[PDB]
């Protein structure tokens, strides 16, 4: 038996189980990165790399070579935020300071960083731990979360310290 | 195929003619596309063999002018070497032609 | 060969259902869609038949 389909205007209703937005609203400790890639990611990547669509795309050789601007700038003008935890070397002579490393660096990369940018040439070993970014809530109750980091305990040869004048 | 398609083959005068007359979406069969590729390759090969036979005829009519009297074996072998022909293979095909003539008669 | 604005016979629907049962072999299961397809199998103790699927979502 058919329905009275001549009484409804041709508009599509909403499905009964309404889908949740793809945006992840959970900011806890088990936050999951979404493996699914969307069109907007590629669009923004092209527009950031070679000014799509106002500029013609560079040839495949330049795009896949080390001279492409992103890789060139990442090599010559590195952007790595290595910050020292003062609670380890402040008014205490310790042999293993603690650093906050971007989660993309490795132990050898951190050793090279400390050896070349600052000159720390006495590094025994590095122990790395991946920690979720520090989350908090402001006065209005909105959930904020800082960038993720990596705790790197760096063992040295000679104990170092920083003296705080009383 | 279908009965109308077989009638159309008989009308066109051959399965190959029917397949080659049908063009693209008119012949929506993948089997038809495969057999059309095969037929095109085989047609090109037949044309190649026709050109080959014409080349052979031209070579024969060019080298017959000197080998017509065949009075001297050395005189014959001079032309055979100038045109690049193996004497043993020539004798073998002469014998094959003789056997074929005996079979025909 | 004209219908005449006449309804279809019952044997037509019977044979259609028989053909559907015969061609019931293939499958349309998708990987990431099984997560939402499993909602028909209410396994959480918070699921209600008359209330719905409201209290089951954390």
């Amino acid at each position: 038996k058919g329905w009275r389909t001549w009484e409804y205007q041709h508009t599509r209703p909403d499905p009964r189980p309404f889908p949740d937005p793809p945006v992840n609203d959970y900011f806890g400790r088990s936050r999951i990165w979404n493996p699914i890639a969307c069109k907007l990611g590629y669009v923004r990547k092209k527009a950031d790399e070679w000014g799509w669509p106002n500029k013609p795309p560079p040839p495949t050789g330049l795009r896949y070579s080390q001279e492409f601007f992103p890789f060139f700038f990442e090599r010559y003008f590195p952007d790595a935020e290595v910050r020292l935890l003062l609670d380890s070397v402040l008014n205490n002579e310790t042999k293993r300071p603690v650093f906050q490393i971007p989660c993309s660096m490795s132990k050898v990369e951190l050793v090279n960083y400390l050896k070349n940018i600052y000159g720390i040439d006495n590094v025994v070993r590095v122990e790395v731990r991946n920690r979720r970014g520090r989350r908090y809530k402001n006065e209005v109750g909105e959930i904020k979360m800082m960038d993720d980091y990596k705790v790197a305990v760096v063992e040295l040869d000679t104990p170092v310290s920083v003296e705080l004048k009383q | 195929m279908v009965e109308a398609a077989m009638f159309e083959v008989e009308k066109d005068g051959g399965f190959d003619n029917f397949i080659l007359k049908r063009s693209g979406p008119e012949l929506r069969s993948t089997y038809g596309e495969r057999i059309r590729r095969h037929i095109l390759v085989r047609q090109k090969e037949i044309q190649k063999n026709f050109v080959l036979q014409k080349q052979a005829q031209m070579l024969v009519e060019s080298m017959e002018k000197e080998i017509l009297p065949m009075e001297d074996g050395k005189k014959v072998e001079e032309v055979l070497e100038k045109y690049g022909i193996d004497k043993e293979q020539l004798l073998r095909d002469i014998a094959r032609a003789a056997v074929a003539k005996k079979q025909q008669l | 060969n004209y219908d005449g604005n006449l309804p279809t016979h019952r044997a037509v629907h019977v044979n259609a259902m028989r053909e559907k049962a015969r061609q019931k072999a293939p499958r349309t299961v998708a990987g990431p869609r099984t997560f939402y397809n499993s909602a028909g199998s209410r396994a959480n103790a918070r699921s209600s038949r008359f209330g719905g699927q409201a209290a089951v979502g954390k």
């Binding site: - | 020539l90 002469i94 032609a97 003789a98 056997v99 | -």
Partner: protein, 70 residues
Amino acid sequence: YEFHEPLRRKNAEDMRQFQTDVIDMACAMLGERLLDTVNASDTSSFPAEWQEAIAMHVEEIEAEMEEVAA
């Protein structure tokens, strides 16, 4: 180039084999026409060794025909 080179190589081999087959078919047709002219005209024969080899090859071909028949 690594994709396209074998194709032109096969084409070159095809041209070489075409020339070889042209030579072979020309030799066969030359033998045919020579035999026809010899068995048609008069006082136009082959040299002694030529006739001997032709007779020997005819014997061999007839033996092969008898073998493939029996």
